[PDB]
Every structure is written in structure tokens, then in C-alpha cells.
Amino acid sequence: MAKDEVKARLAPVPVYTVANPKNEFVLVAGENNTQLGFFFFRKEDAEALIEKIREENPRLARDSKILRVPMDNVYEVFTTPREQTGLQGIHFRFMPDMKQVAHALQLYKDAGVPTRQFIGVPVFQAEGLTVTTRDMQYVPLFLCKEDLDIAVQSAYVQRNAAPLPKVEVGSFEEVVMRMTASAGNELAAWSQVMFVAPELLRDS
Amino acid sequence: YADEWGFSRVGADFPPGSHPSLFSQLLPQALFAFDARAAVAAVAVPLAAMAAGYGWLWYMHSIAPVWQQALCAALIGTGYAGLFKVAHECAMMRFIPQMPGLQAALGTLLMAPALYSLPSWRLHHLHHLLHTNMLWQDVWGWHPLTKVELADEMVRSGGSGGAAMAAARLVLTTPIKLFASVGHWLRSWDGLDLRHFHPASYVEVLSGWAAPLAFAGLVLPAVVSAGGLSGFVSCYLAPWLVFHFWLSVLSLTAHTAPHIPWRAEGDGWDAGRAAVAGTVTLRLPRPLEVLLNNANYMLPQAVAPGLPMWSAPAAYAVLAARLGPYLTEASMSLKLLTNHVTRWQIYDEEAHTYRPMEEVVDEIEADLQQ
């Protein structure tokens, strides 16, 4: 796709960072360069980084706040080479939820693989689960296993009836790179993508 | 022996009939000048200390330890006590006599954070100067609890209990005695009553009351609105308490000792015998004297109420070289504070014997009604 289409499709996914009051970035620097943005999908991990910053430099933790940013601005940050901007070395990695990494490893275990290793943020999808919009049929990519389970169970109990729809989990970085670099029939396959937020089918 | 209480150089005896302004001729006219550098330093150095403390406070608000916060608050309070000394000089019309309007504006602006009034302050301190060490009349000062009044609230109120026998037993037996300038500040509002004052000064008294009221109605809601109770105790209340501690300590060490008597008028009270014999000069380390703006040297200001603040230690050196045995000095130490707290509490009006509260209560208790 174009970056406008990718940003439009990535809008309903929020992520959380740690920011200084003038919308800076608490970029844990570790050792030589290696600054890491650590875009946290879960707010508990962001608060854990806040606790680490509090234990290390207590002046910074009071200034810093958990900034919520939609994935379109995150994609805009990720795309541009940082040498052109003049601030290079900041890695800007993604931090997945540990519970959903464990769920992804469990779903890996079904076929039988090294089920104690994963790459990137897991994205869950059932082979056969479709969302019926106005006259087009989008394919939901579920950021959460519990949301996928609710949708799968509700859909098969509503359409009647065996009814285990495969349930496959991939990496969120690759489903963004394929969206960017897709041109042929993959473009039409990705044009029907739909992104479920990590807390969308909650107790409502 | 009078260094048994840290009262170092003590005074022997002063003849009566003398007036304190009489000794102004002992001070040469070079001290009664205007040093613009000294005035700017006297305003700026305590303001620099206050600015440094507040910059520290905005550096580390709550990540700081309690003792670090206390030290920073003590620095801010000492700086504001120096600024309040500058405002007291402005009230006494001896800081910038060339510009009375700027003098009054500066004094009011520097007394507004203390919730004090410049006209009421100069009125009460002129009353204290005219009635120095005089019983039942000075009020604005460390008037001691006399055994007659303790006897009144000891027998006329019944037994040993009473509201003024518990409040006094809480104040003048405990280190809260070193914060009684809060009670003096509450007394200084005169009940917000204009009928105490001359009808020709109503607008001045109202404006002098309104400027601290403007402070407490504008700046203090901004302080609570920018930090809550945690941002109000550490930013205003602790410096306020430190400044009131300094005011209480200076006022308590000025005119209270076992060798200084308190006599009512007509009994033998005299202005010289109460001023240049009834004043103990507190001595502090030089950074503390600079930060407090020489507020412990009140004797030359008493004997010459036009002598500027920066010439006060030099004029006190002149007066100590001239008068000799009549002056009393005392270094600042724990000995003076523990004596003022635990020993010198009740003033019998018989041999100026400041005594512990109980020992006198014992007399009016196991006797009188018994």
C-alpha cells in the first residue's frame, strides 16, 4: 500500500510510550548508543519502566508521563531513516505482552516447534473468521487471544456448529512490512485487513 | 557568675535618669549615612538565599529526603527573616529616607509574605520601644507570666486546672515557646478592629491590613493550586515556621534574663535602665548575621532610631567600647535555648527570679488555698 493507506488501517491500534513533559522520549540508553524507544502495547509494562526510571533517576520519573499514541504516528516515526532527521541510533523496538507471547508459544506448540522462542508482537487470526461490513467482508487481525476466542466462540455459537478454526499467530512487524510492500494480489488481500484493539471485546 | 547560662558578658548595674537616645552622641555621624552598596547587598543576599532554596525545591520536590527538605526550608526561612528585617527598617523609616514612597512600598511588599502589616508593625514596635521592659503595658514583646497571674488562674479558676493553666503549661514549658511569634502575629491583627486606632489613619490601617490579605487571598491559593498540601507545607508553611522561630528567638533573647528585671511604671522603671541595661545582644556566626541582616543588633537601633541597619555592628562595637560594664551579650547556643525552655518560665515580681513553672505553682498551690 501507500503510507496513507497503511496509516489509515493502523489507526485503531493504540500503543503507550514514556515521554518527558515536552513530548520527548525516555530512551533507555544502556551502553554505547543502543537507545530503545520500547513502544509498550500494555500500560503495565510502561509503568514498570516508570518504576525502573524512578529507582535509577528520581528526577526523570516525576517529569515523565505515559503518552498514548495511535499506531499511525508510530508508523510515521518508524518509517523515516533517522540519519536524515539527524537523530540516529534510537532503535524504536516493540514490546509485546508476556501473556500473549505465552499464548503465541502455546499455539506454536500445536504443530510442534521450538515453543520457547518468538519474534515480534504476536497477532492472532482464525482461518475463517470474517467481519461483515456494509457490502465488503474484512478479515480481522486480532491483537488479543481472548478477543479472538470471544469472537470465534460467539460466531460459531451464532451460526451453529469440527468448529475449531485453526487459530494462527504471526508477528506484527511482518504484517506491517507485508502491508507496505504488497503490490499484486497481496494488495487486495491486505486491503481487507481489520485491526482489533487489544481491549475491544471486553466485559461489555 | 553569669556565664552559667551562656550569658557571657553580663552587665553590673545602670544608674537611672537616662534616656537611650542620649547615647546617640556616642555614635559618630559616619555611621548615619547611606551606603547604596550595603542596601543592595542587604536586600539581595537574603533574596539570593531564598531564590537558591526555591530553585532547589523546584529541582527536587518530593524525591528529596525529609532532612534535606528541612534544611532547604530553614534556608528559605532565614532569607525571609533577613528580608523581614529589611522591611522592619523600612517601617522604622531608616532604610531609604530619601524615597519614603519606595521605602513604604518595599516594606509592605516584604511584609506581605509574613502576613504582617507595616503600619500595625511600626505602631506596635514603637509602643514596645516606648514601654521597654515595663510591666502590664508593653504587650508587644515577651511579657512574662507573673506568679500573680498564675496565682489568679490558679485559685480564681479553682484548682490547678484551667484553660489558661493548660495553654500556658503547653506554651511556656515546651519548645513551642520558640514559636510564640505565631501568637504574637495573631495578636497583631488587633481583632481586625479599627476602633483601636486613630480615626485619621483608617485608610492607612486598612491598606496595611489589606496587603497581607491580598497575599493570603492571591498567592496562597496559587500555592495550594500548584502542589496541594504537600506543595504548601514545604513551600510556604515550613519557611513561615522557620521565620517565626527566628523572630521568637531574637525577641526572647533580647529582653529576658534572670539579671534583667521587669518593673511597672512608678516602681522604679526607667528608659535607660530598661534599654541599655535590659537588652541582651545575641551573637551569631557571621554568615547567619549577614543572612539575618544584622537583626540581632537591636540595641544601637534602640539608642539611635535613625541609624541604618548596615552600620549596626560597627555602632555596637562603638557602644561596647564606650559604655563597658552596662551591656549584656550572649552567644547563640543550645544552653540559652534549653534555659529559656526549661528554667526561665515564670517571673515572680519580687526578685526577678525566672523559675520553672511547677516550683512557682507549688507555692501558689500548696499555699494560698491551703
Q: Residue B361 is placed in which grid cell?
A: 505553682
Residue B209 to residues B106, B108, B202, B212, Cα–Cα distance (Å): 15, 10, 10, 6
Q: Is B233:B61 a contact under the CB 8 Å cutoff?
A: no
Residue B367 to residues B151, B225, B363, Cα–Cα distance (Å): 10, 57, 6
Q: DSSP alpha helices (H): ranges in B92-161?
A: 100-111, 118-130, 147-151
Handedness of CA B297, B303, B305, B310 (dihedral sign): negative
Which chain B residues are closer than 8 Å to A59 by Cβ? 59-60, 63
Which chain A residues are closer than 8 Å to B230 by Cβ? none
Q: Which residues contact B144 (CB under 8 A, 6 or more apart)?
A: B256, B262, B346, B347, B354
Interface residues on A facing B, Cβ-Cβ cutoff 8 A: 58-59, 62
Handedness of CA B174, B143, B272, B97 (dihedral sign): positive
Handedness of CA B283, B286, B291, B293 (dihedral sign): positive
Q: Which helix (H) or strand (E) holds A70?
A: strand A65-70
Q: Is B146:B275 a contact under the CB 8 Å cutoff?
A: no
Between chains, do A58 and B61 touch, taking CB under 8 Å as contact? no
Strands in chain B per DSSP E? 145-146, 280-283, 328-331, 346-348, 353-355
Q: Is A147:A196 a contact under the CB 8 Å cutoff?
A: yes
> Residue B354 pairs with which residues in a beta bridge?
B347
* Nearest Cα residue to A143 out of A185, A67, A84, A201: A201
Interface test with A, best of B62, B63, B69, B230 (most A CBs within 10 A): B63
Largest CA distance in chain A: 58
Sort strands A168-171 and A137-142 into parallel, antiparallel or unpaired.
unpaired
Residue A199 to residues A31, A142, B20, Cα–Cα distance (Å): 35, 10, 84
Q: Is A41:A97 a contact under the CB 8 Å cutoff?
A: yes
What is the experimental resolution, given in Å to one decimal place? 3.2
Sort strands A168-171 and B145-146 into parallel, antiparallel or unpaired.
unpaired
The alpha carbon of residue A12 and the mean position of all alpha carbons in its chain are separated, in whole angstroms, by 11
Residue A26 to residues A51, A87, B10, B140, Cα–Cα distance (Å): 12, 14, 64, 57
The pair phi, psi for residue B329, each rounded to 5°, is: -125, 155
Q: Is A152:A167 a contact under the CB 8 Å cutoff?
A: yes
How many contacts does A have with B, using Cβ atoms within 8 A? Answer: 8
The pair phi, psi for residue B145, each rounded to 5°, is: -80, 105
Q: Residue B197 is placed in which grid cell?
A: 486606632
Collapsing DSSP states into helix, strand and coil, what is residue A97?
A: coil
CB burial string B345-366: b at 16+ within 10 A, e below? bbbbbeeeebbebeebbebbbe
How near does any CA of chain B get to the CA of A90, in Å? 28
DSSP result, B312-343: HHHHHHHHHHHT-TT-EEEE-SHHHHHHHHHT
CA–CA gap between residue B5 and residue B7 (Å, rounded): 5
State the Rg of chain A over Cα: 19
Between chains, do A62 and B59 touch, taking CB under 8 Å as contact? no
Phi-psi region of B273 (alpha: psi -120 to 50; beta: other; left: phi over 0): alpha
Q: Residue A163 is placed in which grid cell?
A: 468448529
Q: Residue A103 is placed in which grid cell?
A: 499464548
B202 touching A (Cβ < 8 Å): no
Residue B20 to residues A164, B270, B300, Cα–Cα distance (Å): 105, 10, 9
How near does any CA of chain B get to the CA of A96, in Å? 31
CA–CA gap between residue A191 and residue A6 (Å, rounded): 9
Q: Which helix (H) or strand (E) holds B66?
A: helix B66-91
Q: How was this structure determined?
A: cryo-EM
B62 touching A (Cβ < 8 Å): yes
Which chain A residues are closer than 8 Å to B59 by Cβ? 59
B231 touching A (Cβ < 8 Å): no
CA–CA gap between residue B132 and residue B114 (Å, rounded): 24
The DSSP 8-state label assigned to residue B159 in this structure reads: S
How near does any CA of chain B get to the CA of A33, in Å? 28
Which chain A residues are closer than 8 Å to B63 by Cβ? 58-59, 62
Handedness of CA B190, B196, B202, B205 (dihedral sign): negative
Residue A94 to residues A45, B42, B260, B326, Cα–Cα distance (Å): 12, 58, 78, 82
Between chains, do B59 and A58 touch, taking CB under 8 Å as contact? no
B61 touching A (Cβ < 8 Å): yes
Give CA torsion, residues A74, A76, A81, A83, to 10 deg: -80
Which chain B residues are closer than 8 Å to A58 by Cβ? 60, 63
| Among chain A residues, CA nearest to B63 | A58
Between chains, do B61 and A62 touch, taking CB under 8 Å as contact? yes
Between chains, do A59 and B62 touch, taking CB under 8 Å as contact? no
